[PDB]
Amino acid sequence: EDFDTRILEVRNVFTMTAKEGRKKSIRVLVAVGNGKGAAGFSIGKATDRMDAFRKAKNRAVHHLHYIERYEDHTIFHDISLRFKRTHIKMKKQPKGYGLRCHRAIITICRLIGIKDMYAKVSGSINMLSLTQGLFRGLSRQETHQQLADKKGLHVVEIREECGPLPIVVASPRGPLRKDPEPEDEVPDVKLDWEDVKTAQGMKRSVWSNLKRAAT
């Protein structure tokens, strides 16, 4: 009863058969979730559209992922991944930002329990690749405790609304390193030209930052 089901795609697939010619079947993609981090998806196939719904939603509840959420409202860090030809870039956002994501991502995020996130989908916009690509990226996000345990250092959150106050979000359970993390004068991290072009005011789009209904 705690799980909600949402449809992501309903397709009519046509199979050519030896004696019966073109036959019509239904392929349905549905996602399930309880709104508290546990969510999954499954494909359903049947000749009738309502049998596909039953198979998909019942099967999905047995293939649930657990998704870690920062403060139970957003992701722990920016996630950029490619699944086949579908690219998804997700950004951690503060409270009140809402879900500014592909409508399918919005639907899945309400099932997971993510309230604030930005996502941009590039390349092929295949609902299945997008769905399983999204769950792959959300299931491989490193939490703050995992980072602290991995590096044996404190994770300190600096918020501009809280000024210079250092907020320790996670501390290692094991011993605490004494050697500071090396401060490489320049990081060799790869950047997204889309993110940089926006921060420099060179991104011009009539479709960006448009007023939309609450999501």
Partner: peptide, 14 residues
């Protein structure tokens, strides 16, 4: 949440 029509009758079994 919404309702899906039930697939079959349980009496229709061995």
């Amino acid at each position: 949440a919404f309702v899906i029509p039930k697939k079959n009758v349980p009496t229709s079994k061995r």
